[PDB]
């Protein structure tokens, strides 16, 4: 199995208490059911099937970004050792099964409102003693810490063993073909979130390879022509919502295996991530892997927020680090198209349009986040949109770097 996880809470963006409403606690972690492996029950085959627009949570990622804040205020055990309680709320039992109003006669010591508290699955001697049971809380704090170490888009991880796909990993994928990127992260997430599965387990390879192929596609390389072992993701033609992704085992030239171990931490860099069901289901999925395998190594420090420096066990700076790249959906897709255009996939006059098509699309998932941003302030104690300042949108982050990290990953 795996008995060791290190987390880091969200950052109260220049704000007092944790940016989550009581109305939220009873909107995700409520109903008394275990708020744990629920993160995914708020996503659809796409975006047009969710209440992710003008509403309490105006974003295809506004849910997790909230449930994640709510998790910070109720994770004191892993911080210090005791259970504590934040505003009349504290886990019912030592197993942290769920949340519930403070008892009445034996209330837990009121939590201490502190931002960015590190976490150690050791500071809580009961966790590992029950592992199996509260297994979920692990993979979750992990999903958290991969969004917390970042400020503008979750930071997942990518791999590619120098070997060919693990047979029973080409068989497991060939049964997930038609399935959309959403339902893939689904199985991915749903999987590594119940019963400690050994990192050796088949599924981990499969769901870890499904996070390497998704990336190759997101950067042309692993396209309809140059597939992985036979797979690649086909994105919906921009003009009718290109924010899609479906796995498709083809049979064109197989992108030869890399010359070595290709590891790197990639995170969406522009606010765009917050509303692209594919930029989340994908990233979220790549995180399903890390959750049941500790954490490859230390994520490079360089490009990362101010509250994520030398974050013990997580962030690094020295050798045990892996350069962390951050791409921008538009500056990205543009090259993703150029790649297609080069492999004869499309016409030479069709990419100067494919971009128009998609670029206008990104301009739509832009006047929307800004609207929701200047709709749900932040001083309002809530953070469904997560501040971003009308700027990062164009921000041509690493991008160019990851577009190269994709080629070396699928030579």
């Amino acid at each position: 199995a795996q008995r060791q996880f290190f987390g880091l809470t969200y950052n109260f963006y220049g704000q007092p208490a944790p940016l989550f409403d009581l109305n939220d606690l009873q909107e995700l972690a409520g109903c008394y059911a275990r708020p744990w492996t629920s993160r995914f029950s708020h996503l659809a085959i796409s975006t047009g099937s969710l209440p992710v627009w003008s509403a309490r949570y105006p974003s295809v990622a506004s849910r997790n970004i909230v449930v994640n804040t709510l998790l910070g205020a109720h994770l004191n055990p892993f911080a210090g050792g005791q259970i504590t309680s934040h505003q009349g709320i504290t886990w019912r039992d030592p197993v942290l099964s769920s949340l519930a109003p403070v008892p009445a006669i034996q209330p837990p010591p009121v939590w201490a409102v502190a931002e960015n508290v590190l976490l150690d699955s050791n500071n809580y001697p009961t966790y590992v003693l029950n592992l199996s049971s509260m297994w979920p809380i692990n993979q979750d704090v992990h999903i958290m810490t991969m969004w917390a170490l970042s400020d503008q888009g979750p930071i997942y991880h990518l791999e590619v063993p120098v070997d060919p796909m693990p047979a029973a990993t080409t068989a497991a994928l060939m049964a997930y073909t038609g399935v959309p990127i959403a339902h893939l992260a689904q199985t991915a997430y749903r999987f590594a979130g119940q019963l400690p599965q050994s990192p050796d387990s088949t599924m981990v390879s499969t769901i870890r390879w499904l996070s390497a192929i998704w990336f190759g596609s997101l950067t042309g390389r692993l396209n309809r022509s140059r597939t992985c072992n036979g797979f690649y993701f086909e994105f919906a033609k921009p003009a009718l919502n290109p924010d899609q992704a479906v796995l498709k085992w083809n049979d064109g030239a197989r992108a030869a295996p890399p010359a070595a171990a290709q590891s790197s931490y990639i995170r969406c860099i522009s606010p765009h991530w917050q509303h692209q069901i594919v930029e989340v289901a994908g990233a979220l999925m790549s995180q399903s892997v890390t959750a049941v395998t500790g954490l490859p190594a230390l994520i490079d420090e360089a490009t990362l927020p101010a509250w994520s420096q030398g974050v013990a066990n997580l962030t690094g700076n020295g050798q045990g680090v892996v350069p962390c790249l951050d791409y921008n959906p538009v500056p990205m897709a543009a090259a993703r198209h150029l790649q297609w255009r080069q492999d004869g996939l499309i016409t030479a006059a069709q990419e100067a349009q494919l971009n128009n098509d998609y670029t206008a699309y990104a301009l739509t998932i832009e006047r929307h986040l800004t609207a929701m941003l200047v709709a749900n302030p932040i001083a309002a104690g809530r953070m469904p949109i997560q501040p971003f300042n009308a700027a990062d949108f164009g921000q041509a982050g690493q991008t160019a770097a990851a577009v190269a990290l994709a080629q070396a990953m699928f030579v």
Partner: protein, 216 residues
Amino acid sequence: AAVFGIQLVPKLNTSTTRRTFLPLRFDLLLDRLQSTNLHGVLYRALDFNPVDRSATVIQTYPPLNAWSPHHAFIENPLDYRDWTEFIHDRALAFVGVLTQRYPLTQNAQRYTNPLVLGAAFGDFLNARSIDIFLDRLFYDPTQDSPITAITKFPYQWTIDSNVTTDSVRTSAGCKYITLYGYDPSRPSTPATYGKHRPTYATVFYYSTLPARSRLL
């Protein structure tokens, strides 16, 4: 300071180095076993009475401490007389079984495997076929001592030495065997710790850390 009822003197003092684990060569194991007197070399009467050759308890060492008797040995225990005789016999007669399968002259400079050697000897006493253990009674120091037990073979059937891919479930040794005439009643008899029993523990050897998580 003091922890509960125990009082702890201020000064802290521990050994400052660890001797590199040394695996017994095949010849040394052959001499240890075939020595004039096994007492001291293999087993050692904890409280041997001078007057008469009698010993309530006997703490044992390596190729013997592994062994865990079968029911017939527990019920109707022997006296320090026939006990020395029992071993002085079996220790020798065992060297035979093991040496005829590995002529000392040609392969003495080969380290025996702590684990298998234990189960291979303990199983010999209980009178269980020892054929399988011999196959890998040796191992190159480079390959882990507990790994050779797995690499050579993932044999999950031999009672008291179930070797899986990552762990080897064997019955803990018996650092103490009690010869007839032993009683935990007297305050004088040496603290056996229940190990005079056959199955008081179950040593699970593991290969790698992930192999251990799967165990716990």
